[PDB]
């Protein structure tokens, strides 16, 4: 797993996590 606010593969936390940055919107996963 990555993190419990995306889902199990998330293409953009595939590389790590971008969630890092952000919470998790448009301008993160979405
Ligand atoms: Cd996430
Ligand atoms: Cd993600
Ligand atoms: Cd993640
Ligand atoms: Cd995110």
Request: charged share 15%.
């Amino acid at each position: 797993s990555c993190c419990p606010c995306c889902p199990s593969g998330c293409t953009k936390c595939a590389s790590g996590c971008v969630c890092k940055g952000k919470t998790c919107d448009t301008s993160c996963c979405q």
